Amino acid sequence: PPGPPGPPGPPGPDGPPGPPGPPGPPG
Amino acid sequence: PGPPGPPGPPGPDGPPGPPGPPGPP
Amino acid sequence: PPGPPGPPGPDGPPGPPGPPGPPG
Known part of the structure; x- marks a missing residue:
């Protein structure tokens, strides 16, 4: 081997x- | 000689x- | 070897x- x-x-x-x-929330 | 070892993770x-x-807005 | x-x-x-984006 x-x-x-x-x-x-x-x-x-x-x-x-x-x-x-993720996008931020609306203002 | 032996072969290469296994691939790494x-x-x-x-x-x-x-x-x-x-x-x- | x-x-x-x-x-x-x-x-x-x-x-x-x-992270989440800022508020509008």
Whole structure:
């Protein structure tokens, strides 16, 4: 058999920004 | 040599979105 | 000998919505 597999890779990049929040209420 | 290890997990959550729009007058 | 580290993972989840907007 081969050498062992290498270690697990690192976490990926940050996710994308979220959407805008809800609109504010009417004045 | 062995193979590459498994892929890593997903990264951190993304940043929050921007504030929502102002409400109507 | 061991293999190399695996690749970096996927991009993370999307972030949460932003805060509510201001009153008009």
